[PDB]
Design an enzyme around this catalytic site. Sequence first.
Site, short mmCIF file in Angstrom:
data_model
loop_
_atom_site.label_atom_id
_atom_site.label_comp_id
_atom_site.label_asym_id
_atom_site.label_seq_id
_atom_site.Cartn_x
_atom_site.Cartn_y
_atom_site.Cartn_z
CG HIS A 1 -8.76 -21.17 -11.98
ND1 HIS A 1 -8.39 -20.27 -11.01
CD2 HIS A 1 -8.16 -20.76 -13.13
CE1 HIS A 1 -7.61 -19.35 -11.54
NE2 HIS A 1 -7.44 -19.63 -12.82
CB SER B 1 -4.33 -22.70 -25.74
OG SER B 1 -5.54 -22.10 -25.33
N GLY B 2 -4.69 -23.95 -22.54
CA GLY B 2 -4.50 -23.79 -21.11
C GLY B 2 -5.45 -22.82 -20.41
CB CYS C 1 -7.35 -18.67 -16.12
SG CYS C 1 -6.04 -19.86 -16.49
C1 LIG Z 1 -4.60 -19.53 -16.39
O1 LIG Z 1 -4.34 -18.13 -16.33
C2 LIG Z 1 -3.26 -20.33 -16.51
C3 LIG Z 1 -2.30 -20.36 -17.78
N1 LIG Z 1 -1.06 -19.61 -17.58
C4 LIG Z 1 -0.57 -19.07 -18.61
C5 LIG Z 1 0.69 -18.34 -18.61
O2 LIG Z 1 0.99 -17.49 -17.73
O3 LIG Z 1 1.46 -18.56 -19.55
C6 LIG Z 1 -1.47 -19.16 -19.79
S1 LIG Z 1 -0.80 -19.92 -21.25
C7 LIG Z 1 0.57 -19.13 -22.04
C8 LIG Z 1 0.22 -18.89 -23.50
N2 LIG Z 1 1.27 -19.49 -24.29
C9 LIG Z 1 2.36 -19.98 -23.46
C10 LIG Z 1 2.92 -21.24 -24.03
O4 LIG Z 1 3.13 -22.26 -23.39
N3 LIG Z 1 3.19 -21.10 -25.32
C11 LIG Z 1 4.03 -20.02 -25.78
C12 LIG Z 1 2.68 -21.97 -26.37
C13 LIG Z 1 1.79 -20.04 -22.07
C14 LIG Z 1 -2.65 -19.96 -19.24
C15 LIG Z 1 -3.98 -19.27 -19.45
C16 LIG Z 1 -2.38 -20.17 -15.26
C17 LIG Z 1 -1.16 -21.05 -15.26
O5 LIG Z 1 -1.81 -18.89 -15.22
#
Ligand SMILES: *C(=O)[C@@H]([C@@H]1N=C(C(=O)O)[C@@H](S[C@@H]2CN[C@H](C(=O)N(C)C)C2)[C@@H]1C)[C@@H](C)O
EC number: 2.3.2.-
Length: 349
Positions: free
Chosen positions: A278, A273-274, A296
């Site tokens: 870090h 899910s991400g 994160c």
């Molecule tokens: C860690 O903070 C990193 C990632 N960034 C995110 C963001 O701002 O969206 C999240 S994931 C977010 C949850 N669902 C979205 C999606 O793609 N779907 C709707 C399925 C994205 C993540 C922790 C950094 C990039 O900010």
Amino acid sequence: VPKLTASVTDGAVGVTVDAPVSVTAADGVLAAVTMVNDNGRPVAGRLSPDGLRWSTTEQLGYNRRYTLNATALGLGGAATRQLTFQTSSPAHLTMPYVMPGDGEVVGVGEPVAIRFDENIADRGAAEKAIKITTNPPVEGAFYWLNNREVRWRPEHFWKPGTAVDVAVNTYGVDLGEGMFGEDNVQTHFTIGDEVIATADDNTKILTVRVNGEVVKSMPTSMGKDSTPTANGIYIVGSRYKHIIMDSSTYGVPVNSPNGYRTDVDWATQISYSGVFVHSAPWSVGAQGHTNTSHGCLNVSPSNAQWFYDHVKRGDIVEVVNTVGGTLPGIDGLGDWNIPWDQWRAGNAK
Ligand SMILES: *C(=O)[C@@H]([C@@H]1N=C(C(=O)O)[C@@H](S[C@@H]2CN[C@H](C(=O)N(C)C)C2)[C@@H]1C)[C@@H](C)O
């Protein structure tokens, strides 16, 4: 006269190529045994030193007709026999891929993963075609994450020092709807040290334990109430020295309020899910005090590089007491959040 037996019947069709073909003689010995295709090319085979049994030594092909000739000689004289059979004709082929990589040392949370490049109509067959060996031996079970990937793990985290051998013996197996395995895949890995890191939202401290002893504490800043970090057991995945994160991917333009193109150092991934652990120099003041991220686990630049250096694929991050829910069992690295009874009962049907 000598008696000849074979592991195939004359005129059989749909003969599966998951097994070698063998020939045996009683009341005598095999003088010779050949097997050829319909272009008269021989199939590699071996005859036992005592002359009693012969077997093929290389994979037979699909859509093939084989002709077997064998001659045995004994005290009562000679006997020569012949048969033909035809092998399976697949509707399609699928190829399997297995993680972790061969030779690898992984953490105690690492599941065996087998991913196919096609949907598996008969999960039951796929499971039975996969042979997993463990030393010290331990009970485990198959659970499917989706239509193409099946996972395998014990009830509890692996015991350090366990050797895991995985034989994905799919070649020649009807995996459903005329789908057969394209090839076999073999891999071997080892479980290392028990590394379990625990982020307690109550304290905002990420404490890392190695074989039960704290070797590191890290102040952290997890996801804010709007976008909280889910509680649960996370399995460590890939790590990156440097990574970007574009909102352009997922629809959001970077030149928008919630848009973000962000250079990030020392990122250890712990969920599909991400969610990442870090380097977050810009949140150092909030770390150990306030949640500020999108989910994160933000830590200092040197705490993030420590983690990237000393934590391995398959290690465990346990998140507790936050205001999120629980990480989905089928996230991709969320396997341990499915209770054993449900996991062991599986979903092959
Ligand atoms: C860690 O903070 C990193 C990632 N960034 C995110 C963001 O701002 O969206 C999240 S994931 C977010 C949850 N669902 C979205 C999606 O793609 N779907 C709707 C399925 C994205 C993540 C922790 C950094 C990039 O900010």
